[PDB]
Amino acid sequence: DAREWGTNLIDKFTGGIRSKISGLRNWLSELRNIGAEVGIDVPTIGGGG
Amino acid sequence: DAREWGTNLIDKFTGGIRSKISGLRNWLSELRNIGAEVGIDVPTIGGGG
């Protein structure tokens, strides 16, 4: 019983480890916005100006 | 007892590491994928110029 719950409870617990390691998607999205989103407004010196 | 600890420790490790193996290959997508603003929204070449 301590396996039967325990294994999948402990997998549940490393859902905790999965916090930052899934959040890595979000962080490396943002770290690409810094090279890909920034370029939308920057040329408005032309596109608007 | 062995089949308990010897499984559940691996649940700790692998429940985490599955998110590494997938998550790294997600960032290898993010940098191209959210990079795609460079070819989607950034290029005023598409008419605005």
């Binding site: - | 290898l28 070819g39 290029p43 070449i45």
Partner: protein
């Protein structure tokens, strides 16, 4: 006419040629290729009617964009050199290097072989270095050709 059919991206074979020679410029390892002939459309409207009266083409070009992952010294030095010349440094002159471009693809179950050819493609910018931690260098070109010189089924 020929039945429409799926096309598989990895079956493509892109090539670049010097228009002075029709000689191949070494280029390889593409990942993405998009070719798009385009015109400006003037959509004309009349007095009183809310409906469009006419539409007219002007100012043709072919948008070419390529992403590739094998660096070519020949292609890069041809771009630096301008027409009919090769250079290891930026040139302070007004003529861009014009490349003839051709892409060839079988259709996914062999119904046809589509050849697309474009004259005088020019690229405003050339990525030389494109490094990212833990990645092979990936290079993206955007450029414009003058016209589509060929779009045909080149199968036997």
């Amino acid at each position: 006419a020929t039945s429409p059919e799926g096309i598989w991206s990895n079956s493509g074979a892109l090539t670049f040629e010097d228009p002075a020679d029709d000689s191949e410029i070494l280029f390889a390892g593409v990942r993405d290729v998009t070719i798009t002939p385009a015109y400006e459309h003037a959509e004309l409207y009349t007095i009183d009617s809310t409906f469009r009266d006419e539409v007219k083409r002007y100012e043709h070009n072919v948008n070419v964009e390529i992403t590739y992952a094998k660096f070519s010294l020949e292609f890069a030095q041809e771009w630096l050199g301008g027409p009919g010349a090769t250079a290891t440094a930026s040139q302070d002159d007004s003529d861009p290097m014009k490349f003839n471009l051709e892409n060839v693809t079988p259709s996914a179950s062999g119904g046809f072989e589509r050849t697309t050819a474009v004259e005088n493609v020019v690229f405003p910018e050339l990525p030389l270095d494109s490094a990212t931690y833990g990645e092979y260098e990936e290079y993206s070109l955007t450029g414009s050709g003058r016209s589509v010189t060929n779009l045909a089924d080149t199968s036997g």
